[PDB]
């Protein structure tokens, strides 16, 4: 039964952008859904979104541009050290100059360039390109 909420909150997106739609409807929301979304929004991959609430756990309605190829989740959230980001990043990402893998790290959820110049590390969460 329903085990991960984020894992099918990103399966609902690219399943309805392979068919070229413009908006999707997510259910339920989460504190870690929104911050995964807020890092695909300061880089341009999605548009804007709204949070319903209905007193249980809200839904979300997202607006998609044209620019996502794939966004995903990595399901045992393993434990990335600090010398081992660049082996995760040479395998998941299509080329060396774009795309991002994001991490839950002791100073917030962030992408993998942003974690380099703050000099932190944590557990993996997903990717986006």
């Amino acid at each position: 039964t329903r085990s991960s909420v984020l894992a099918d909150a990103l399966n609902a997106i690219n399943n309805a952008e392979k068919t070229g739609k413009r908006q999707v409807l997510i259910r339920p929301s989460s504190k870690v859904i929104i911050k995964f979304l807020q890092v695909m929004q300061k880089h341009g991959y999605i548009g804007e979104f709204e949070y319903i609430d209905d007193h249980r756990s809200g839904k979300i309605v997202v607006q998609l541009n044209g620019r996502l190829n794939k966004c995903g989740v990595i399901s045992p959230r393993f434990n990335v050290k600090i010398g081992d980001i660049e082996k995760w990043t040479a395998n998941l990402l299509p080329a060396r100059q774009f795309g991002y893998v994001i991490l839950t790290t002791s100073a917030g959820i962030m992408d993998h360039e942003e974690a380099r110049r703050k000099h932190v590390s944590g557990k993996i969460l997903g990717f986006v390109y």
Binding site: G44, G66, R67, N69, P94, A95, R96, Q97, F98
Partner: protein, 217 residues
């Protein structure tokens, strides 16, 4: 001589189109092999495999000859066709013409930093046909091409200097292998990278700027 009988052909016979990219921007269909020859005079072929093949008509075993011919530049344009025929030297020359007809570009990018020309692929790509998969991967300088010899010879004529391959599936029917490396190139223009994010306005076709010309009588 050459009579153009298709209305693209009159436009290029009169010399209203100087590069092949106007065929590619508005994605125009091409059906006369003389158009490419004046457009790309440096084109150049090799033959990959020639195999006799057999059909038991009337229990009379008539021989055909299948040929696999790749044509290609050494800048970014390739082509590939296959033709069976009754005689050997007809199957080669008929095999060239379909390969001249199917020419596609290739986006050639970098590995890492930005010094000088592009050598390797832009991203990673993959095409599958039949049961074979073939996947192409960017490489640093000095790498060269690591592939099988039948696939290394293809990528010379598209002019990629360094690339990394990895192929799955039954790779020992070469008509199907080359038809997978072909798909895995031609997708390179089609992956929307972030520098292609900006907006441009639509241009207008040559097939109605010069509309009075290239019209039948």
């Amino acid at each position: 001589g050459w009579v153009p009988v298709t209305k693209l052909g009159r436009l290029v016979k009169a010399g209203k189109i100087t590069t092949i990219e106007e065929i590619f921007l508005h994605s125009l269909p091409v059906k006369e092999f003389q158009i490419i020859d004046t457009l790309l005079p440096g084109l150049q072929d090799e033959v990959m495999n020639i195999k006799p093949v057999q059909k038991q008509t009337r229990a009379g075993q008539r021989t055909r000859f299948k040929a696999v011919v790749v044509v290609g530049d050494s800048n970014g344009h390739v082509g590939l066709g296959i033709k069976t025929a009754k005689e050997v030297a007809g199957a080669i020359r008929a095999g060239i013409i379909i390969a001249k007809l199917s020419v596609i570009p290739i986006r050639r990018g970098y590995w890492g930093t930005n010094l000088g020309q592009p050598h390797s692929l832009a991203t990673k790509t993959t095409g599958k046909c039949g049961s074979v998969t073939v996947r192409l991967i960017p490489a640093p300088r000095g790498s060269g091409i690591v592939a099988s010899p039948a696939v290394k010879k293809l990528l010379q004529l598209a002019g990629v200097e360094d690339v990394y391959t990895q192929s799955n599936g039954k790779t020992r029917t070469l008509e199907n292998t080359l038809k997978a490396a072909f798909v895995a190139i031609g997708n390179t223009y089609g992956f929307l990278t972030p520098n292609l994010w900006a907006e441009q306005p639509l241009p207008v076709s040559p097939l109605d700027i010069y509309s009075d010309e290239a019209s039948a009588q």
